[PDB]
Structure 1
Amino acid sequence: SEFFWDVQKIQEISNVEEHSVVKCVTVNTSRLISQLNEELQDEESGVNFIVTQLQLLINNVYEKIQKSPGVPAHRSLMINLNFTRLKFSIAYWDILLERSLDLINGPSKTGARYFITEVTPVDRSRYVENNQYFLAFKANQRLTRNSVDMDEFIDFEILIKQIIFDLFKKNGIPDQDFEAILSRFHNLESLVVAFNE
Structure 2
Amino acid sequence: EFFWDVQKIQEISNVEEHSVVKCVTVNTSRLISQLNEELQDEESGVNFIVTQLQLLINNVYEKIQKSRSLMINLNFTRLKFSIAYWDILLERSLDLINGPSKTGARYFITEVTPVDRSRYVENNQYFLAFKANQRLTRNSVDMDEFIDFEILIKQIIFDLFKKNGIPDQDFEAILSRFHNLESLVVAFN
Normalising by the smaller structure, the TM-score range is: over 0.9
How far residue 143 of structure 1 moved from its aligned partner, in angstroms, is 2.1
Q: Could you say which residue in structure 2 is the equivalent of 1:21?
A: 20
Q: Return the alpha-carbon distance in structure 1 between the equivalents of residues 161 and 102 of structure 2.
A: 51
How far residue 130 of structure 1 moved from its aligned partner, in angstroms, is 0.3
Q: Return the alpha-carbon distance in structure 1 between the equivalents of residues 104 and 111 of structure 2.
A: 23
Q: Return the alpha-carbon distance in structure 2 between the equivalents of residues 80 and 150 of structure 1.
A: 35
For the aligned residue pairs, the C-alpha RMSD in angstroms reads 1.1
CA shift digits 1:26-46 (9 cap, x unpaired): 000111111100111211110
CA shift digits 1:127-163 (9 cap, x unpaired): 1010111111122213232121245533111000000
TM-score for both structures, normalised by structure 2: 0.96
Instruction: Indicate which of 109, 120, 143 corresponds to 1:127.
Output: 120
How far residue 171 of structure 1 moved from its aligned partner, in angstroms, is 0.6
Q: State the identity as a percent.
A: 100
SS of the residue corresponding to residue 92 of structure 1 reads helix
* Unpaired runs of at least 5, structure 2: none
Q: Return the alpha-carbon distance in structure 2 between the equivalents of residues 152 and 53 of structure 1.
A: 52
* Unpaired runs of at least 5, structure 1: 69-74
Distance 1:153 1:27, change over 3 A: same
Deviates more, 1:91-100 or 1:171-180: 171-180
CA shift digits 1:8-64 (9 cap, x unpaired): 111011110000000000000111111100111211110000000000000000111
How far residue 175 of structure 1 moved from its aligned partner, in angstroms, is 1.3
SS of the residue corresponding to residue 172 of structure 1 reads coil
CA shift digits 1:94-132 (9 cap, x unpaired): 000011101112010111100001111111111101011
Count matched residues: 189
